[PDB]
Amino acid sequence: RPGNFLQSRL
Amino acid sequence: PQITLWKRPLVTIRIGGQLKEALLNTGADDTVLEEMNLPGKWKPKMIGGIGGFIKVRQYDQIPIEICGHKVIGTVLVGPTPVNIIGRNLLTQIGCTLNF
Amino acid sequence: PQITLWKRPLVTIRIGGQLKEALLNTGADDTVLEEMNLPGKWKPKMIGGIGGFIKVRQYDQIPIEICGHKVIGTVLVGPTPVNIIGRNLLTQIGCTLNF
């Protein structure tokens, strides 16, 4: 399952 | 509360009058919710994640209650796999990491 | 220590006796490091999130020190844009969220 919810502005 | 990390740190939120489940995410700059309607003006934005970039709608100054704590701030709406509470709102509710 | 969330929670880690900067990411199940030529056996894996999936190499039982706290477990390696410490190692160093 998707499991790495890194999120970054830009 | 104090939340350990053996399971995903999922909590209930209320936004636009509706309840949802969301992940407390220190790896996210911003808060990103799955497709939904929110009132008011929005701006098109892009954001990046582990797999690349997606398009989202940015709503500013949105009230959101997170595990009983009030926040008012920016909420992004788009094709995220999971609802994410990011640092923009974790800071508003006084959240820290501790070890 | 207590880490506030005004900025990205980047800390120093040691793997191979060498130092790197890594993001403490309560939104990650697993730990994934930027591409590096680590020795040992590995298995291919796909990890996903915002923007889709990336291909990574899975290494098992790799020691890793996070802010002076020893850990050992599964470490993924691949084209992540930033070194990420996920819950598999955050639990080992006794990390909690608190608000």
Curated annotation (Swiss-Prot), chains B, C:
The active site is at N25 (for protease activity). Residues 1-5, 49-55, 88-99 are annotated as: Dimerization of protease. Signal peptide: none annotated. Residues 20-89 form the Peptidase A2 domain. Aspartyl protease that mediates proteolytic cleavages of Gag and Gag-Pol polyproteins during or shortly after the release of the virion from the plasma membrane. Cleavages take place as an ordered, step-wise cascade to yield mature proteins. This process is called maturation. Displays maximal activity during the budding process just prior to particle release from the cell. Also cleaves Nef and Vif, probably concomitantly with viral structural proteins on maturation of virus particles. Hydrolyzes host EIF4GI and PABP1 in order to shut off the capped cellular mRNA translation. Homodimer, whose active site consists of two apposed aspartic acid residues. This is Protease. It comes from Human immunodeficiency virus type 1 group M subtype B (isolate ARV2/SF2) (HIV-1).
